[PDB]
């Protein structure tokens, strides 16, 4: 919904390459988008912190090779969550304006002479129905996880004793997750989150050529394209599944 506020504010543009500025133009949108992002990266004591981080240590808390492996896998995923979370907020709000005059041209600075009463469109915020849900969801994104963890997690919590959820006792790991997990691996997501955010924020707006050097390398160019093209799954699905079925039908009808 915060993204929808931005897309409305800049006349339906959806490409990061044409955002920038907007921090003073959409302050409420930026604030809730920042609040939501810290919940997504499981920043400590946010709502998302109580759920995601427990999932991670629970993976470690099941002292098995698969459980340890997924922990490492989901940790790298957490790294890139922080990266694209930084990418959104910075490219939309914190960076220099990569979009045109119209988004940022304000009536305070004189630009027009006869078309002064109108013709400014300065990329402002939305109305009450647009902004009220943002404020409400912002509050849930801060306190709801803390308010409710004892229900869903507890430690011997009996909220699901109607057998809605069944956990066989041999599959219990929560005791080891609470007590057997070393503190280093418990706070490791936060160390990674608080650092790659610094690394991402420094790479832009301070460096900004290094990523470019990577992009214009053949290694980086191929890496950039592969991930931008979603592991090439849509390409291979379309080629060998969808078009395969269409050609089967073509043969059946014709031959």
């Amino acid at each position: 919904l915060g993204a929808g506020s931005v897309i409305h504010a800049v006349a339906d543009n959806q490409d990061f390459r044409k955002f920038g500025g907007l921090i003073s133009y959409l302050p409420l949108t930026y604030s809730v988008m920042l609040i939501a992002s810290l919940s997504l990266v499981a920043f400590p004591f946010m709502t998302g912190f109580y759920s995601k981080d427990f999932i991670l240590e629970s993976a470690y808390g099941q002292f098995s090779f698969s459980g340890v492996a997924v922990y490492i896998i989901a940790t790298i995923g957490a790294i890139f969550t922080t990266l694209y979370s930084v990418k959104v907020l910075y490219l939309t709000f914190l960076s220099n304006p990569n979009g045109p005059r119209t988004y940022y041209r304000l009536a305070i600075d004189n630009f027009f002479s006869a078309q002064a009463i109108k013709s400014y469109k300065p990329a402002h915020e939305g109305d009450f129905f647009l902004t009220l849900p943002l404020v409400i969801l912002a509050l849930f994104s801060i306190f709801f996880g803390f308010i409710t963890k004892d229900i869903f997690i507890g430690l011997g919590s009996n909220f699901f004793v109607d057998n809605s959820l069944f956990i066989h006792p041999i599959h219990e790991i929560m005791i080891d997750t609470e007590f057997a997990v070393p503190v280093l691996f418990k706070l490791l997501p936060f160390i990674f989150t608080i650092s790659f955010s610094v690394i991402a924020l420094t790479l832009s707006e301070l460096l900004s050529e290094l990523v470019i050097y990577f992009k214009f390398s053949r290694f980086g160019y191929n890496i950039f394209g592969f991930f931008n093209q979603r592991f090439l799954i849509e390409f291979f699905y379309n080629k060998y599944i969808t078009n395969l079925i269409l050609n089967l039908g073509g043969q059946i009808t014709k031959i």
């Binding site: 409420l28 946010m46 902004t131 912002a138 801060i142 306190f143």
Partner: peptide
């Protein structure tokens, strides 16, 4: 909007400081 923007941001960090 600025007050609403500032209030939740203040609410978020004060909440974080409290639980810290």
């Amino acid at each position: 909007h600025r007050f609403l923007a500032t209030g939740l941001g203040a609410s978020m960090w004060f909440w974080i400081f409290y639980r810290a």
